[PDB]
Amino acid sequence: HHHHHHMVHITLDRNTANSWLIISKDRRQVRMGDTHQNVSDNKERFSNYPMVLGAQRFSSGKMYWEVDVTQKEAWDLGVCRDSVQRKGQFSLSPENGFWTIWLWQDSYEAGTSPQTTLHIQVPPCQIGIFVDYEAGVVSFYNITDHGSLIYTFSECVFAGPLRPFFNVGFNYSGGNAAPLKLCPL
Numbered sequence: 252h253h254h255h256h257h258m259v260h261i262t263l264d265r266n267t268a269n270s271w272l273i274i275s276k277d278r279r280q281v282r283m284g285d286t287h288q289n290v291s292d293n294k295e296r297f298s299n300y301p302m303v304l305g306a307q308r309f310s311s312g313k314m315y316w317e318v319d320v321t322q323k324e325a326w327d328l329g330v331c332r333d334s335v336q337r338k339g340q341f342s343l344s345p346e347n348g349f350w351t352i353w354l355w356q357d358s359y360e361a362g363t364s365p366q367t368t369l370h371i372q373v374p375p376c377q378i379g380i381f382v383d384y385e386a387g388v389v390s391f392y393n394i395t396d397h398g399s400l401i402y403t404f405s406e407c408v409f410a411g412p413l414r415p416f417f418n419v420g421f422n423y424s425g426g427n428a429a430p431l432k433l434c435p436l
C-alpha cells in the first residue's frame with residue numbers, strides 16, 4: 252500500500268483500560284498484569300475483557316498506524332465508536348460500533364456478524380490499520396508480508412467519532428503475556 256504518509260502518533264488512554272492492564276510510561280505499550288493494577292473504577296473502563304482505547308478521536312480524514320503483535324496467541328485490533336458499551340458482555344461487530352480483526356486459536360477472523368475467515372499465509376508480527384472517515388473504509392495490512400492486504404471493511408457507518416481499539420487478550424495459557432506495542436513512524 253501507499254498509506255504510510257497518513258501516519259498518526261497514537262497513545263493509549265489509561266482511564267479506558269480494564270483494571271488489570273499495565274500501560275507503559277510513554278503510553279505506547281500495554282500488557283496483562285498478574286492482578287488488579289490498583290486503580291479506581293470508572294464508567295469508561297472495559298469490565299469484562301482486557302481492552303483499552305487510544306486517546307485520539309477521529310471524525311474526518313485519513314489515518315494510519317501500526318501495532319506489534321509479536322509472540323501473542325490472542326488479540327483484537329481496529330477502531331470503534333467513542334460511545335461503545337464498556338460494561339458487560341458484547342460481540343465485536345459493526346452493529347455494536349466496532350471495526351476489528353483478531354487472532355484466536357491459530358485462526359485470524361474479521362469482526363463481522365457473523366465473523367469472516369481471513370486467509371493469512373505469513374503470520375503477522377506487525378499490523379497496519381488504515382481509516383478513511385469520509386469514504387467509510389477500515390483496512391488492515393500485514394507489515395511482515397510486504398504490506399499485503401488482510402481485510403477491508405467498506406460502506407462503514409461510523410455514526411460518531413472513532414477511537415483506536417485494542418484487546419491484549421486472555422492469558423489463561425501462560426503463552427499470551429506479550430504486549431501490544433504502537434510502532435514508531
Ligand SMILES: O=C(c1ccc2c(c1)OCO2)N1CCCCCC1
Pocket residue numbers: 269271283298299300301420421422423
Ligand atoms: O486473561 C485473564 C483475564 C484478563 C482480563 C479479564 C479477565 C480475565 O476477566 C475479566 O477481565 N486472566 C486473569 C484471570 C485468570 C488467570 C489468567 C488470565
